[PDB]
Amino acid sequence: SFSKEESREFMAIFPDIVRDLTDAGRHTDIPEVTKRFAKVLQYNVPTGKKTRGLSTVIAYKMLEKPENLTPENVRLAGILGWCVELLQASLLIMDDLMDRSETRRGQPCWYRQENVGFLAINDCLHVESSLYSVLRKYFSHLPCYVPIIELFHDVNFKTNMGQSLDALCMKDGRPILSQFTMKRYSSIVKYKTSYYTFQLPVSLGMYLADMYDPEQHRQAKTILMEIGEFFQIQDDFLDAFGDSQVTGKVGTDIKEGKCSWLAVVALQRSNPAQRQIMEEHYGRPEPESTQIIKNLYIELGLPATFAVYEEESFNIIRTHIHQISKGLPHDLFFKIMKKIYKRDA
Amino acid sequence: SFSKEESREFMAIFPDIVRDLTDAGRHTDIPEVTKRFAKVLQYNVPTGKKTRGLSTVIAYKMLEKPENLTPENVRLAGILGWCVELLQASLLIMDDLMDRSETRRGQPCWYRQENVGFLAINDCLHVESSLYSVLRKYFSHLPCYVPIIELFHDVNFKTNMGQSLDALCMKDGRPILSQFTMKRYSSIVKYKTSYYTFQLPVSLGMYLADMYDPEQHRQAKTILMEIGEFFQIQDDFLDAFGDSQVTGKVGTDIKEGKCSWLAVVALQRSNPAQRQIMEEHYGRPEPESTQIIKNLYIELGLPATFAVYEEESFNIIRTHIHQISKGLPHDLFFKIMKKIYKRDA
Ligand SMILES: O=P(O)(O)C(O)(Cn1ccnc1)P(=O)(O)O
Ligand SMILES: O=P(O)(O)C(O)(Cn1ccnc1)P(=O)(O)O
Ligand SMILES: C=C(C)CCOP(=O)(O)OP(=O)(O)O
Ligand SMILES: C=C(C)CCOP(=O)(O)OP(=O)(O)O
Ligand SMILES: [Mn+2]
Ligand SMILES: [Mn+2]
Ligand SMILES: [Mn+2]
Ligand SMILES: [Mn+2]
Ligand SMILES: [Mn+2]
Ligand SMILES: [Mn+2]
């Protein structure tokens, strides 16, 4: 689980994904575009932490019968993991344009790079569509094919709903702070993050292991939605308080007026003077307004508030994993939480 | 074909599609975004001429055995046509962002609406993903289900390749005029327009009629790519010479430095002085420069050249239809060509 050997095995597949999409004897009349797409893939797909792709393989190895774990079936789980990584890559290209971000994975965001700009918009769609080409190549003769493509379809649609709810934080250049509740927060993160980051890898592992029981899927979902909310709260903490040299990205949530966990908790914790600071300075383009909000988050003790929350929530989620039944391996969920707890990136 | 009653039948399906995507008892925890998505669909999907969707129905009606053309199967063909219209709607949202366009279908481009902006990228992805939900609801039981899903994903990938070749007209803010050949042009149009506009409707009609022979799809493709080249050449002519109140869109190709048909033929026809006018003024945002290029296009006689092309190409394509397999209905291709060329004879 999240070992050097598992990482080597997963990265070994990446060159074959690139070949499948750009050098498989198709589209031989437009090599300018196919060579450029190979670069799109090289830059935007493989330089993250790869937790979703690696989790797809770990889920499969922990769900499948040991006697069925052939080189070929483990490679298929890795290919499914790369299809989740293509989905992630696509989402981040669009997200960085929508959030006016500077850096991603330690480099300038794709849309900012020389002679990219608005080309990043098509590249996002192209990366998304490419995962279905990979699924068709490897899975089209297997019983899991239709469930897998339908799951990717459904998760895409849900992720788009979450990305829209996330974007509705601002109207006419001011944040809708009266609506920044923990209820709204939980709904945003369920849709924009939890389905594609946590539900999708585990459901893919289940499908490849010929596990289709709707009740087993629903019990995995309940715990993976809790893990997803936890994970997004960590992401929100890193936006304001992370070291951008370690996280690889400069935060934008304050300037973009987002209904982040920090904003929700700041509103819960603020006295009336602090609430007026949020009303005046949250979601503004001016660097001085964002620093006023960061200084409010410091004064409120939001770093220590997050640290306590993270520890308390880690323990609650593990209590809930202990209560899982429907024949699901508790250690799969424990390994996912161990990997993310106390992360700084 | 392309009659008022056929339009009535087709249009009646749209409200059912909107209900399927926004008011079918799903995602009941996020009514803010489902209600917004209904508005996205209303603005962006049924506001065109519906040639592609209507053509899907006509293709099915001409390819299926007459004895099998039940109201129910004709309605299925209509649903597939609306899936093509969801793909069109998505592509135009993103295209208008990429092309920095003002109007589409006689209203502001979606991204220009208040509280839209780069959220239009997310709306584009959401509208395309929608069509796969529609396919699952209505077609999941039929032999054609997987081929239809795969055709949509393949056509999306190809269209993305075409959109990227189209975008690579400019480098470092100046057009790559030496590369603006008719060979490059024909490649751009094949990928960015012809597959999704002409091949997709016909191949969908074929699949719904249980026609899986790749040779029948390929015979159709030869004709449909020729019609697609005229359709995109007409679009390019009207970008400079159309009336925006009639076309519903303000042209941008000169300012954007595009490898349009006008640019390609201008470079073929230009004397050295005229080529220097293209070098200095093509692909510039300054309105003087764009008017100087339009004046060059007039001086070169490009309007008459286009009118000759519209007449000659109709007659060349008609001759080519005569040579198609006796196994395909020649009149389907004649009907498509007559509608695109606005001719009864
Ligand atoms: O905070 P976001 O939701 O924008 C983010 O987490 C990306 N994202 C998009 C949807 N779910 C997550 P990132 O901080 O990586 O920019
Ligand atoms: O000229 P474009 O290719 O941008 C266009 O035809 C749209 N489009 C996009 C792909 N194929 C066609 P429109 O003139 O409608 O803006
Ligand atoms: C859902 C979220 C928080 C987006 C970023 O995901 P990661 O932090 O896993 O980013 P990468 O490893 O893929 O770069
Ligand atoms: C491929 C092209 C030329 C894009 C516009 O297509 P239409 O002119 O068919 O657009 P709508 O009817 O859908 O508005
Ligand atoms: Mn972001
Ligand atoms: Mn975001
Ligand atoms: Mn974030
Ligand atoms: Mn355009
Ligand atoms: Mn365009
Ligand atoms: Mn055009």
Side-chain angles (χ1 to χ4, degrees):
Chain A
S1 320
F2 302 112
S3 71
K4 307 171 178 214
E5 188 128 305
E6 289 172 326
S7 289
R8 177 169 295 174
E9 166 201 287
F10 185 71
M11 269 308 293
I13 304 169
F14 182 72
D16 285 355
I17 302 295
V18 171
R19 179 224 36 232
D20 293 339
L21 292 175
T22 67
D23 195 26
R26 308 263 205 274
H27 312 123
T28 63
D29 58 340
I30 56 166
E32 171 172 350
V33 168
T34 65
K35 178 172 225 161
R36 183 181 174 288
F37 188 61
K39 181 182 180 179
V40 171
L41 294 173
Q42 178 190 72
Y43 275 48
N44 292 288
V45 183
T47 80
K49 298 174 299 284
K50 295 173 287 290
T51 301
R52 296 164 186 72
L54 292 166
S55 293
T56 304
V57 180
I58 292 162
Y60 178 64
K61 288 176 178 167
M62 293 187 75
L63 292 161
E64 181 59 275
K65 301 170 170 39
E67 61 262 25
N68 289 334
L69 291 179
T70 66
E72 291 73 21
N73 283 334
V74 167
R75 182 170 145 107
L76 289 174
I79 298 166
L80 289 179
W82 279 107
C83 289
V84 182
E85 296 294 333
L86 288 166
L87 179 49
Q88 166 73 329
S90 72
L91 291 167
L92 302 187
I93 291 165
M94 159 182 71
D95 181 84
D96 286 335
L97 267 157
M98 288 183 60
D99 296 345
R100 308 190 175 266
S101 292
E102 288 176 21
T103 59
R104 172 65 66 183
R105 294 169 176 174
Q107 299 297 339
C109 297
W110 182 239
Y111 77 96
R112 296 182 59 231
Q113 289 189 28
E114 195 157 350
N115 286 308
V116 183
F118 282 6
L119 274 69
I121 297 166
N122 183 242
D123 292 332
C124 157
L125 270 70
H126 199 174
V127 173
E128 157 72 52
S129 71
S130 80
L131 75 85
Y132 298 94
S133 177
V134 173
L135 288 178
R136 178 179 175 173
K137 174 167 177 174
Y138 293 103
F139 296 85
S140 68
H141 299 295
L142 297 181
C144 59
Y145 186 52
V146 171
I148 288 169
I149 69 191
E150 289 183 348
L151 176 62
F152 270 102
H153 298 157
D154 183 59
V155 168
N156 281 342
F157 182 98
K158 285 167 155 62
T159 305
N160 294 319
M161 288 182 296
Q163 190 75 352
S164 289
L165 192 59
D166 180 274
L168 293 174
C169 55
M170 295 261 277
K171 186 177 168 94
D172 301 332
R174 304 301 313 119
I176 58 167
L177 297 177
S178 65
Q179 299 175 63
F180 283 21
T181 65
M182 201 61 75
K183 179 186 186 283
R184 182 190 188 83
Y185 181 78
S186 296
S187 296
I188 296 164
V189 305
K190 166 178 173 180
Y191 286 90
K192 79 164 179 176
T193 287
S194 300
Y195 285 111
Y196 89 94
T197 298
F198 291 104
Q199 192 236 330
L200 173 64
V202 172
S203 282
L204 288 171
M206 291 177 74
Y207 290 160
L208 189 59
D210 280 332
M211 296 168 68
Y212 302 104
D213 183 77
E215 258 316 295
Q216 283 198 310
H217 281 263
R218 165 183 195 162
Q219 176 134 82
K221 182 174 160 177
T222 300
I223 192 65
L224 292 165
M225 297 289 109
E226 289 184 31
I227 294 174
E229 178 160 333
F230 173 93
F231 180 77
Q232 189 63 49
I233 293 167
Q234 299 177 305
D235 183 65
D236 293 356
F237 173 74
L238 292 173
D239 188 87
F241 289 110
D243 176 349
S244 59
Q245 294 302 113
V246 173
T247 68
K249 63 193 192 184
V250 173
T252 58
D253 291 339
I254 296 166
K255 165 177 180 160
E256 295 299 312
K258 292 290 156 59
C259 187
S260 72
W261 186 83
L262 292 176
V264 173
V265 172
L267 296 166
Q268 290 176 352
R269 291 176 83 90
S270 283
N271 63 33
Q274 292 169 325
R275 175 54 169 269
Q276 195 37 60
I277 295 170
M278 289 287 286
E279 291 286 355
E280 186 168 357
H281 290 291
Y282 199 72
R284 296 286 194 181
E286 290 84 12
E288 302 85 344
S289 286
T290 290
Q291 192 62 46
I292 286 166
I293 299 304
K294 172 66 175 303
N295 293 347
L296 172 63
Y297 285 4
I298 291 166
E299 164 171 65
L300 287 173
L302 296 194
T305 302
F306 168 74
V308 167
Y309 180 79
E310 186 190 28
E311 293 181 10
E312 288 181 348
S313 181
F314 172 82
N315 290 322
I316 291 159
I317 290 166
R318 292 184 85 261
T319 297
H320 296 165
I321 293 166
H322 171 67
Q323 296 159 355
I324 290 168
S325 40
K326 297 299 140 91
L328 292 173
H330 291 182
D331 293 340
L332 173 53
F333 306 101
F334 289 138
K335 288 164 179 298
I336 291 170
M337 286 297 294
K338 175 180 186 176
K339 179 55 177 174
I340 60 170
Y341 180 47
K342 304 271 193 187
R343 68 195 182 90
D344 66 356
Chain B
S1 310
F2 300 108
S3 74
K4 297 171 302 180
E5 182 56 49
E6 287 177 319
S7 279
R8 185 187 196 280
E9 159 199 291
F10 185 69
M11 301 324 140
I13 302 168
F14 181 72
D16 289 337
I17 304 289
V18 172
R19 179 169 310 110
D20 292 343
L21 293 172
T22 65
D23 191 27
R26 299 197 174 188
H27 319 126
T28 64
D29 57 338
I30 55 162
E32 180 174 346
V33 276
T34 66
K35 285 177 191 185
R36 179 181 178 283
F37 191 56
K39 293 180 174 279
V40 174
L41 289 171
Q42 177 184 54
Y43 190 99
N44 293 289
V45 183
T47 45
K49 300 177 293 301
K50 301 105 178 169
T51 302
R52 293 162 189 73
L54 293 166
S55 292
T56 303
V57 180
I58 292 161
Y60 177 64
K61 286 177 179 171
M62 304 196 63
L63 290 161
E64 179 60 273
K65 304 218 173 67
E67 54 259 49
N68 290 150
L69 287 176
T70 62
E72 296 83 0
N73 294 328
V74 166
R75 188 161 197 273
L76 287 177
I79 296 169
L80 290 180
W82 276 110
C83 289
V84 183
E85 295 296 334
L86 289 166
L87 178 55
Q88 165 73 330
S90 171
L91 291 169
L92 301 187
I93 292 167
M94 67 93 68
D95 181 80
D96 284 340
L97 195 68
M98 290 182 61
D99 295 345
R100 315 308 293 134
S101 294
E102 288 174 17
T103 58
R104 167 70 68 186
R105 294 161 172 183
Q107 58 185 359
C109 301
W110 180 237
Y111 79 94
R112 296 186 65 95
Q113 289 290 352
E114 293 194 320
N115 301 302
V116 185
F118 286 121
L119 182 52
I121 303 162
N122 189 62
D123 293 329
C124 152
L125 280 160
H126 198 175
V127 173
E128 192 270 355
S129 181
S130 289
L131 77 85
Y132 302 93
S133 178
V134 175
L135 290 177
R136 179 175 172 176
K137 176 166 175 171
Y138 295 104
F139 296 83
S140 72
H141 64 300
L142 297 177
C144 60
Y145 182 49
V146 170
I148 287 173
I149 292 169
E150 290 182 345
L151 179 63
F152 273 102
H153 288 302
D154 192 63
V155 167
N156 197 290
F157 185 94
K158 285 166 157 61
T159 304
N160 296 318
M161 290 184 300
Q163 286 294 82
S164 287
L165 192 57
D166 179 273
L168 292 169
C169 57
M170 296 265 273
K171 185 175 178 175
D172 303 326
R174 302 300 308 118
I176 60 170
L177 297 177
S178 67
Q179 294 173 68
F180 287 12
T181 65
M182 194 63 75
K183 176 177 183 174
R184 183 189 187 85
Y185 182 78
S186 293
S187 297
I188 297 165
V189 172
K190 167 178 169 181
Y191 285 93
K192 78 163 178 176
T193 290
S194 299
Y195 277 114
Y196 92 91
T197 298
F198 293 107
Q199 188 68 40
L200 174 62
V202 169
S203 283
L204 289 170
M206 286 186 176
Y207 288 151
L208 188 62
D210 284 329
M211 296 170 61
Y212 301 104
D213 180 354
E215 181 60 11
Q216 291 186 309
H217 291 259
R218 188 203 69 76
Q219 280 157 171
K221 183 165 83 154
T222 304
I223 302 302
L224 295 169
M225 296 298 107
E226 295 176 11
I227 295 170
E229 189 159 300
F230 167 76
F231 184 71
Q232 191 64 51
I233 289 170
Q234 178 184 247
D235 183 62
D236 294 354
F237 168 73
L238 292 170
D239 185 269
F241 288 103
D243 178 347
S244 63
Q245 299 309 130
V246 173
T247 67
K249 57 195 195 188
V250 173
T252 57
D253 289 344
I254 295 167
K255 156 169 178 175
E256 292 296 317
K258 293 287 156 62
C259 188
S260 72
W261 179 86
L262 291 173
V264 169
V265 176
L267 294 166
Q268 289 177 349
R269 294 300 301 175
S270 282
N271 69 27
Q274 290 168 328
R275 171 55 170 267
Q276 185 63 19
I277 291 176
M278 289 288 286
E279 294 283 356
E280 217 272 55
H281 291 292
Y282 200 70
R284 303 278 201 174
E286 285 78 15
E288 179 195 357
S289 286
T290 297
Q291 188 62 48
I292 285 170
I293 298 303
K294 179 149 192 194
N295 289 352
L296 177 63
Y297 291 175
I298 294 164
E299 175 56 25
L300 291 175
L302 298 188
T305 303
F306 172 70
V308 170
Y309 179 79
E310 178 164 347
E311 182 269 305
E312 292 186 344
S313 65
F314 179 85
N315 292 298
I316 291 162
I317 294 170
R318 195 194 53 258
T319 300
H320 291 165
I321 290 170
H322 283 290
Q323 309 156 17
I324 293 303
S325 177
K326 165 153 186 185
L328 288 189
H330 293 197
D331 203 37
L332 170 58
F333 299 95
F334 290 134
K335 280 173 186 298
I336 290 166
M337 187 176 57
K338 284 189 301 183
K339 175 57 168 181
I340 292 306
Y341 283 86
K342 294 179 185 58
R343 286 178 56 153
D344 290 325

